[PDB]
Design a protein around this ligand. Structure first.
Ligand SMILES: Cc1cc(/C=C/C#N)cc(C)c1Nc1ccnc(Nc2ccc(C#N)cc2)n1
Lengths: 554, 412
């Protein structure tokens, strides 16, 4: 007997205020019982479970399911109730590594460690809560009672406890062997290195020797798994990665579900296939919520899909990360609030790609969208590579400077450079900071009756020019905007406009270049055509002449 | 050698706050720091049976090349039972804001000498993440009072109280105030001796049992405050008068006696904006009366210790920023203006981050607590970058303003 180090148990507790499960065992057929008795007999002989006295008051239902119509049976202990009462654990699985962040490896060996799983003892004081009962033949004797000694499959804490136990064992090996990487997924350990293969195989034997100190043995065979690997929807190869085959189905008619499925595939594909578009297809799902409801494909969407099938025509792979080189992120504007990007280190060899869609909102502008895309890429990059990439953006350095020095909010974009690839992001208009000498002054105003919804919009100018237009189905806010629009329409290339609308100023000072309001869009089109515009604000109902509210008070 | 028991507020469980993305440089710094803290018994590795978490990151104090671990205990602090100390509540020192000089000292290290109640340790869990989540995050929990936690100064108070008795009895005029990991020491002394007392103080602390070498000098006596001012001109255009009436209309919400009727009269008619308008005597007198009203303090302004302090900031351009601190709208308790060049000639966001720390510091000195900020920036931009420029050991709360306030210019 060679002494082995025991595996420390994790102390587990039920949620505060809760007791163990007391669920009634289900009636089973004579056939299933003999099967369960046989099954439990060896488990017991194997140390996994132990017979318990009548004292224990807890219970969990055990079942028997035939195996794909085999000669064998399998036991299923349903821990759903115990799981609802078991404490929460730290789940280290959240946020999986992204392939573009991985490093290329010459070799990646796989080791089966499913057996090690049963060397992990379950906290002695929690064992009682795992009690179960194999009914007796004909219910004429007491059912056989057992409780677990090891992590039960299906129990809430098994995955976290198994992983943390294996990690603690592996820790010193990883630390003292910096030339290898170890990753656990399910019942396997994946060990990779760039070592001359002889030395790599030696490292594997050392790992098996290390694990034996806890009496954990490994198959001593050549695991079936070898590069490439199918993992979390990706294909990992020694020096490249890609997403698993994306197949867009041919269809004569699509339903809400089919489209949600399609968009899911396109989104997954967009991380390496450049240009993928999903706006025209996504908007079709605007409040449908009926999986079966067949929706007709707009010609706009039929076009987007055809463009995507083209992009998905042939396989595309991304390369792995080389810590010794800079990271570059290039962005392009696609239109309709869509943006696309590529992250690479060497020209034409993307590590990954991606897209960004503008946020929901009444008014927006291209510079703000570009900024949001930059922030999103920056954060993703910190997660995957731990650093910010250098950016290549379709906006002139001069345009950016004019924008941020004049914008009312603080804003920032990290180290970047202009890349001249249309369409370029630009500022479409810029209001004056001071009144224009020589330019006609338009005093505008609008008002609407809250009940009748009737209103008026208009202006009076220093040259005696005047206009008042009657409006229906309107509000104070819309008449205020209409008044400004009339002034822009009827003035020359330079104009001074005086308004008392805090609402209209709130919008224009936000500098939108596009809006969900056709009225605001018409105003933007006029601002773009003018040479100079000064917009002045004054308090309403304060006896400021030109403030011709009277014309619109009827 | 013994620990004072601690518990969470009734009906509240420990924090479970996600760890945000960390740069490679900050991860390496934290791995090195925690490895030494673990060896010294300050923290211990934890198992999967601890599901709690508080974010951690790293910073560099004002001009220091050495990384400092900083745990964001904002959540734990609002969930940790109010630790009213034996002090019955040390009345905030009103004299601190009046001192000629105030140095800020980082005494957070002292905390690590006092053990933390074993049953509360689980709630201080934190994670050092790995780049691309390639390896399991390193999990730890504190065994001693942690820096940044609300209950640390509270529990260490009694120890600090007697640690300073000597220095305090021999210097009964010096004001010493403690907020979280910082010690504020103020005295009217000539900056040269003021410093002697300070360095003496830390040598008096280092000897007493405990990077305390750093110092941060503030001058409350030379602090920023702002009255409302109107333009003085020889020729007023229609536009100048429109801007004045607008500003006066805004001010009338703060000062009840403000009038614009006589000035508004000048604006009757549809005149060219650049046309010069001569002021009548009635309008001139009205402007004069308003100027006088604006030289008097605001009526009914008082601080209430049970109410939150609110701080608003406006970007004025060219590196200038204005701000106001109040509890009730239009009842400003403090207003100010900054224009600073520590490193952000061309970085809006660094400037705002520095303005936020300066305002918080002023707030701690004056009222002994931090304000809630209304920041003129998009949430995404702020959250992506503020930690890159942070240099304080505390962290205030903040919210975002997405609509341009019309009152921007009136404050500059
Ligand atoms: C996340 C991960 C998943 C698997 C695999 C899980 C599965 N199935 C295998 C390993 C070894 C790792 N860990 C790391 C860590 C750093 N670089 C890499 N690079 C890397 C990994 C696999 C291949 C290949 N072929 C090439 C390079 N892998």
């Amino acid at each position: 007997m060679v002494p082995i180090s025991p595996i420390e148990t994790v102390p587990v507790k039920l949620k505060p205020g809760m007791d163990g499960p007391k669920v009634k065992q289900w009636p089973l057929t004579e056939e299933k019982i003999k099967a369960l008795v046989e099954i439990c007999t060896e488990m017991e002989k194997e140390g996994k479970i132990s017979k318990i006295g009548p004292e224990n008051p807890y219970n969990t239902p055990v079942f028997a399911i035939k195996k794909k119509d085999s000669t064998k049976w399998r036991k299923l202990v349903d821990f759903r109730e115990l799981n609802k009462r078991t404490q929460d654990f730290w789940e280290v699985q959240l946020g999986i590594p992204h392939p573009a962040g991985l490093k290329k490896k010459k070799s990646v060996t796989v080791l089966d460690v499913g057996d090690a799983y049963f060397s992990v003892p379950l906290d002695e004081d929690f064992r009682k809560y795992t009690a179960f009962t194999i009914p007796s033949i004909n219910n004429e004797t007491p059912g056989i009672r057992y409780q677990y000694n090891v992590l039960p499959q299906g129990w809430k804490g098994s995955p976290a406890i198994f992983q943390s136990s294996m990690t603690k064992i592996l820790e010193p090996f990883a630390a003292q062997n910096p030339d290898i990487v170890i990753y656990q997924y399910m019942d396997d350990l994946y060990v990779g290195s760039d070592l001359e293969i002889g030395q790599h195989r030696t490292k594997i034997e050392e790992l098996r020797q290390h694990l034996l100190r806890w009496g954990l043995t490994t198959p001593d065979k050549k695991h079936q798994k070898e590069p490439p690997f199918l993992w979390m929807g990706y294909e990992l190869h020694p020096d490249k990665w890609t997403v698993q085959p994306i197949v867009l189905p041919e269809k004569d008619s699509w339903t809400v579900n089919d489209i949600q499925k399609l968009v899911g595939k396109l989104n997954w594909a967009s991380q390496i296939y450049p240009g993928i578009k999903v706006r025209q297809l996504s908007k079709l799902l605007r409040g449908t919520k009926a999986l079966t409801e067949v929706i007709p494909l707009t010609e706009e969407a039929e076009l987007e899909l055809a463009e995507n099938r083209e992009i998905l025509k042939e396989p595309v792979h991304g390369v792995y990360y080389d810590p010794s080189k800079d990271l570059i992120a290039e962005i392009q504007k696609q239109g309709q609030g869509q943006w696309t990007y590529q992250i690479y280190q060497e020209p034409f060899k993307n590590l990954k790609t991606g897209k960004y869609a503008r946020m929901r909102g009444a008014h927006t502008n291209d510079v703000k969208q570009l900024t949001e895309a930059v922030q999103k890429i920056t954060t993703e990059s910190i997660v995957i590579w731990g650093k910010t990439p250098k950016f290549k953006l379709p906006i002139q350095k001069e345009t950016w400077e004019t924008w941020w020095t004049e914008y009312w909010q603080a804003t920032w974009i990290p180290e970047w450079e202009f890349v001249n690839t249309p369409p370029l992001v630009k500022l479409w208009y810029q209001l004056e900071k001071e009144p224009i000498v020589g330019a006609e002054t338009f005093y505008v105003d609008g008002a609407a009756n809250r009940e009748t919804k009737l209103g008026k919009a208009g202006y009076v100018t220093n040259k005696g020019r005047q206009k008042v237009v009657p409006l229906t189905n309107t509000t104070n806010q819309k008449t205020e905007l209409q008044a400004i629009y009339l002034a822009l329409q009827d003035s020359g290339l330079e104009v001074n406009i005086v308004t008392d609308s805090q609402y209209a100023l709130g919008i224009i000072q936000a500098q939108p270049d596009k809006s969900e309001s056709e009225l605001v869009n018409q105003i933007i089109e006029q601002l773009i055509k003018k040479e100079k515009v000064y917009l002045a604000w004054v308090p309403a109902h304060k006896g400021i002449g030109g403030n011709e509210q009277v014309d619109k008070l009827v | 050698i013994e620990t004072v028991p601690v518990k969470l507020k009734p009906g509240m469980d420990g924090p479970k706050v996600k760890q945000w993305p960390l740069t490679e440089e900050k991860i390496k710094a934290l791995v090195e720091i925690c490895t030494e803290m673990e060896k010294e018994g300050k923290i211990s590795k934890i198992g999967p049976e601890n599901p709690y978490n508080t974010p951690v990151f790293a910073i560099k104090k004002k001009d220091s090349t050495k990384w400092r671990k900083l745990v964001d205990f904002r959540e734990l602090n609002k969930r940790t039972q109010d630790f009213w100390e034996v002090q019955l509540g040390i009345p905030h020192p009103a004299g601190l804001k009046k001192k000629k000089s105030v140095t800020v000292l980082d005494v957070g290290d002292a905390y690590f000498s006092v053990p933390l109640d074993e049953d509360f340790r689980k709630y201080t869990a934190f994670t050092i993440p790995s780049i691309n989540n390639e390896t399991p995050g390193i999990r730890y929990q504190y065994n001693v009072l942690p820096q940044g936690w609300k209950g640390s100064p509270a529990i260490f108070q009694s120890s600090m109280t007697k640690i300073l008795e000597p220095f305090k009895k021999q210097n009964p005029d010096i004001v010493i105030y403690q907020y979280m990991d910082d010690l504020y020491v103020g005295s009217d002394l000539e900056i040269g001796q003021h410093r002697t007392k300070i360095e003496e103080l830390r040598q008096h602390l280092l000897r007493w049992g405990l990077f305390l070498w750093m110092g941060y000098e503030l001058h409350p006596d030379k602090w920023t405050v702002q009255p409302i001012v109107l333009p003085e001109k020889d020729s007023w255009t229609v536009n100048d008068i429109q801007k004045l009436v607008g500003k006066l209309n805004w001010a009338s919400q703060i000062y009840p006696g403000i009038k614009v009727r006589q000035l508004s009269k000048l604006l009757r008619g549809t005149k060219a904006l650049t046309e010069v308008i001569p002021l009548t005597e009635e309008a001139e007198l009205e402007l004069a009366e308003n100027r006088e009203i604006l030289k008097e303090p605001v009526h009914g302004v008082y601080y209430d210790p049970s109410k939150d302090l609110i701080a608003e900031i406006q970007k004025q351009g060219q590196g200038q920023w204005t701000y106001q601190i109040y509890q009730e709208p239009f009842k400003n308790l403090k207003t100010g203006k900054y224009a600073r060049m520590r490193g952000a000639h061309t970085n809006d966001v660094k400037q705002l981050t520095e303005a936020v720390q300066k305002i918080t510091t002023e707030s701690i000195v004056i009222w002994g607590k931090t304000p809630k900020f209304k920041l003129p920036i998009q949430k995404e931009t702020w959250e992506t970058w503020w930690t890159e420029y942070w240099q304080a050991t505390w962290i205030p709360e903040w919210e975002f303003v997405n609509t341009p306030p019309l009152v921007k210019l009136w404050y500059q």
